[PDB]
Amino acid sequence: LTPLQQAALKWARKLAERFPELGEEFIAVHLEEARFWEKAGATPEEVDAAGKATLEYYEAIRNGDEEKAVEARKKALDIYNKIVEALKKQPPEVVAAYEAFRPRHEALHRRAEATLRAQYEAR
Numbered sequence: 001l002t003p004l005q006q007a008a009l010k011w012a013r014k015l016a017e018r019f020p021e022l023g024e025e026f027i028a029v030h031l032e033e034a035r036f037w038e039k040a041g042a043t044p045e046e047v048d049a050a051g052k053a054t055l056e057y058y059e060a061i062r063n064g065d066e067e068k069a070v071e072a073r074k075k076a077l078d079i080y081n082k083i084v085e086a087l088k089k090q091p092p093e094v095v096a097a098y099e100a101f102r103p104r105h106e107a108l109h110r111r112a113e114a115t116l117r118a119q120y121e122a123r
Contacts, residue, residue, distance in 0.1 A: 007044040008034040011051025015058060019116060029108040036098055040086035050079050061116045 012030045016023035034047060056072035087098055 004034045004038045007047045008051050011055050050076050
């Protein structure tokens with residue numbers, strides 16, 4: 001397997017092992033992305049970070065530190081923007097792929113956030 005796929009697995013596992021509600025697609029949906037990312041001159045360290053960020057983000061969404069969230073939800077967000085843009089500078093043979101998958105990457109996060117917040121809004 002590609003060292004990028006694996007680099008995202010390091011953190012996705014930690015995010016699946018934790019919050020096992022959705023221990024599944026949290027890996028896959030991300031994994032697929034790590035293969036797209038590869039197809040945009042991405043480096044493992046440009047991914048590792050992103051994950052660990054997301055990690056920070058969610059587990060802070062869990063505990064509830066609203067500062068640590070934006071700290072992480074933005075450092076991650078201030079990486080993929082570039083990547084999507086690099087992927088945007090690619091053929092409409094790969095573009096047609098991301099313009100259908102990305103939706104699910106959005107859907108994962110939009111779902112995850114929501115659920116993971118709803119958890120703590122339940123004492």
